[PDB]
Amino acid sequence: GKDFRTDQPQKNIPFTLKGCGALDWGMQSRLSRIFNPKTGKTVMLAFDHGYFQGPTTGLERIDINIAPLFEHADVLMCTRGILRSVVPPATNRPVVLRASGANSILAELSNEAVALSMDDAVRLNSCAVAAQVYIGSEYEHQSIKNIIQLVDAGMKVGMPTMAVTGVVRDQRYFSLATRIAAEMGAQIIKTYYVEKGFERIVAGCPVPIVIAGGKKLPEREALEMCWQAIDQGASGVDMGRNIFQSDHPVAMMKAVQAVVHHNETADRAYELYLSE
Amino acid sequence: GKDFRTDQPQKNIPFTLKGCGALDWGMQSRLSRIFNPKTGKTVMLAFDHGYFQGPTTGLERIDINIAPLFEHADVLMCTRGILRSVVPPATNRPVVLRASGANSILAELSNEAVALSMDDAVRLNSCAVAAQVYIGSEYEHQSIKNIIQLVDAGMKVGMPTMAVTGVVRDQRYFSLATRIAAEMGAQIIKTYYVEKGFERIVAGCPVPIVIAGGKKLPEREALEMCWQAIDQGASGVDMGRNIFQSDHPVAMMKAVQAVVHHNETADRAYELYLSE
Amino acid sequence: GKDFRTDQPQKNIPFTLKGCGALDWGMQSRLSRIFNPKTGKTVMLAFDHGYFQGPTTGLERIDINIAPLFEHADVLMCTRGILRSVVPPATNRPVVLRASGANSILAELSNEAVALSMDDAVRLNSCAVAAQVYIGSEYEHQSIKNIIQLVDAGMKVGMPTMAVTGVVRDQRYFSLATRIAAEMGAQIIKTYYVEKGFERIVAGCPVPIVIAGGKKLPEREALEMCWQAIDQGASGVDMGRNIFQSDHPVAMMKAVQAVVHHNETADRAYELYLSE
Amino acid sequence: GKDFRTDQPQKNIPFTLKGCGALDWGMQSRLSRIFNPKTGKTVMLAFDHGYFQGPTTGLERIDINIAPLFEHADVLMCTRGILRSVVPPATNRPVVLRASGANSILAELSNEAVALSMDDAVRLNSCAVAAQVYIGSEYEHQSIKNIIQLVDAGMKVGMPTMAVTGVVRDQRYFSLATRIAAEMGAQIIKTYYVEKGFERIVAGCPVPIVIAGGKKLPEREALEMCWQAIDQGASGVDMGRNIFQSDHPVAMMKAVQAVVHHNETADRAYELYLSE
Ligand SMILES: O=C[C@H](O)[C@H](O)[C@H](O)COP(=O)(O)O
Ligand SMILES: O=C[C@H](O)[C@H](O)[C@H](O)COP(=O)(O)O
Ligand SMILES: O=C[C@H](O)[C@H](O)[C@H](O)COP(=O)(O)O
Ligand SMILES: O=C[C@H](O)[C@H](O)[C@H](O)COP(=O)(O)O
């Protein structure tokens, strides 16, 4: 009384996330916590800014101000320090750990080193680790070695690496920076939206691209930037300031979600925002 | 223009999952993928039976028969062989890996060894690893050593261990087996429901208890068993046969979820079942 | 304006704890958490019985029944499983970890293996690790290798090992067991009190000896036993049953303390007991 | 005849020490030796100044001058050289080890490297390790890397790291330095008290803050500084000069204790001081 269904042969189910179709199960599994498999996109809440800036505006009290936002994000991005101290583990939300540092606003910005061992990233149950690359800066070379080192250690263990292009802010520059990062082995690339040519940044990059929010904009313009980036091929957005510095952060996030996951237009999204 | 809210002191948020209030963030984060933080409970779909039994009834074709069930479970439990081969990583569901084996139905049941390295559990992004303890059996000693080994390795890396009490099936026996396992350091205990005294099994165990389904019962009796176990303090149920051997598995899961998470009565749950 | 006090030469302060005068700082510091430096003695509350016995009488609920006792003890002894789950780290009391197991009441008693790595002992901030030696039993050989292995690992790390003589219960037997253990390198020995010859067990053993409580006695007889052991040169007592199975455990501990640290007579101690 | 108390469910006891609610048992246990669990505060006696200064005033003879003070402190802070040579292990007091060095008063101050391996901190049974961060200095980068390194190694082992903000001495500067250090993962931060805005330093830092004494003040002014820091949210004080350079060091410590643990006013405390 057993049924092997020998008339229906077993068939592999393809993994579609851009450029991640030849990774081991664990790594694909981690990537699937970050990018929703249905939509292939992500809404990321970043609040790691303190790692070289100290208590920056809006992030003075993560425990009070930012904690109510966690549930509305797909994925959290922050440092192990903030994570252990004030992000309740019961939050049950994927985390990308900031894994570079040792710079500050008082010195050369690009002077970064790896700021956590893979050992501890694993211990914290990260989905990914993140480092800045600074093409064109004084410490460009070290910043790439940082990526190299994370990818080397990450491959032993199934942990994806995210390279973030730290900084002329034009297409040919980001194309350079994103492509080198990808070519060194980063599975995720975070960069900035650009008025013209962003399409080419995405096209020339073989792995998922996520955009950073940049400085605080009026809510409707920020939603336009999201709309454009998504429309032009970005795999998600990672806002900070544009969310945590808004007067209605929860509403903003709902709007961003509509744009990113549900193909909402910039306008409808803004009206969704206004209704909270 | 910064607000530190110095009139409101920072306060730690308690972690309430039974017996897991003193573990590191990463370990508490993995336990929070398994036990829903709101309810403190879990519905787990087990299908590792193949590890010593071969193609058992209902599990001849995981890829066809079981795959549509994944989305309805809180957590999956299986071996690394099934995981890589036929569980699509896009499933985006927590997994507990079977980490013991090297026995079969053709020999002494209790003759198990560790069947995967922690190295690989981490590579697969597990939430926990599971092994059998066989108190009272010929290879009792080795079976405990297996737990000791996994706990040792798991603590280096933030990986919870689940001890499963393999097998007179009464309260004093299970009290013995569960308590030894917990005492040796397992963070989760899986055991069987018992007609009388189950409350004591729960009370005498300092960490979360999940019950196994056992042999196929009529759906309404299975739901009674769940209800009783939950009512008497179990932190979750881990059915296999009672789900994948039912004629309406998806319906049975929804029913089990109502009992486990939503305080439904056995009867209401059965009616919920009947409406699919 | 500096004063080097060149007229008064620096002088080393001797460490007096029996046979521990040639250990490194860290190991001596850990031993000093256990044995009060003023008196050279310890009151230890043991509740690791579960490790091979399951929920034993008095230890069904450590969290309710035993937790109120912690503050009255010098040092706690238990398993890592109990420690992480139900001993609040805020207790701020030195712990000795049970580091052997994989035996049970349903099989050969002496069949023990090392039950925690030194790695995790250090992670838990233990003061010492304990294992049973079973001279005369079936698995005598393995049990001494257990001690050997912990002492080897403990010397790398400054962790003291306590050997426990598990079981004819006479002087010549305990002299054999305690001396072998010490000769292998254990820094602390736990054994049983004996009607006659106990003085010789102490004299023939070059390191501190602590006595186990044994089965429940009437409070006054238990206090006599302590009195005798301390009088005859024991460095402390480690009661379990005689404390946690008493009707007035807190009172019993205060009595035990008076005998052990303050040279109270058996009688006075019993009256001290009666006044709570 | 067993009582499981099935009518009273097990309940986790919360750990309240600011921002240390998600750490493993051993790390919480080490932190509880430092910060009294009742009050959440600490009085720390620091005498590590020798590490880059040689025999500084008051510390010419630790063995004579400082030894009688140990018993009145909650926790000792010094180097491993001092600890092994002249701190008697029988002192039975928690120690925080200075773990940075290789600078001196004859060269650039911020040129520090890690001065002891975690291996040896464990060997010494420390409760924490400490190192200087020098935001804004020439070797700022290396100094952060030192913290990173200690946290990485500390996490493997359950050892908390204390970052000390070495040095314009205003709020916005210490906010930067404390927050970066916390963000990199230090569990304890030691900084200086500031005339204005100290409240904000505390609020913006997600982990415990302890203040350094600074240069010798008249006893009553020193007690005012304590009172203010504690009142504004500091978790403790770590005096050196203000204690060991006073004419009545034991009296001063009792006064500091009254301020720190018992809510004494600056005035009462000074009168308490005067009465020895
Ligand atoms: O160095 C990167 C930034 O500080 C943030 O972590 C993020 O990547 C971009 O900033 P925002 O989210 O505010 O736009
Ligand atoms: O050895 C354990 C079993 O094979 C299953 O993995 C499970 O733990 C219990 O069986 P069932 O879910 O069918 O009740
Ligand atoms: O195997 C040793 C025992 O179980 C206890 O840990 C203790 O060493 C002696 O027992 P009791 O304290 O009850 O006398
Ligand atoms: O570099 C730090 C100092 O030398 C001391 O160790 C301490 O942290 C602060 O100095 P004081 O206790 O004298 O105020």
Author numbering:
A (entry chain G), B (entry chain E), C (entry chain D), D (entry chain H): 10 to 176, 181 to 289
What does the paper say about this structure?
While sequence analysis suggests that LsrF will function as a class I aldolase and genetic data suggests LsrF is involved in P-AI-2 processing, the details of the role LsrF plays in processing P-AI-2 are not known. To begin addressing this question, we have determined the crystal structure of LsrF, alone and in complex with the P-AI-2 analogues ribose-5-phosphate and ribulose-5-phosphate. LsrF crystallizes as a decamer with each monomer having an (αβ)8-barrel fold, a ubiquitous fold commonly seen in proteins catalyzing aldolase reactions. The LsrF oligmer has a disk-like structure, with two rings of five monomers stacked on top of each other giving rise to a decamer with D5 symmetry.
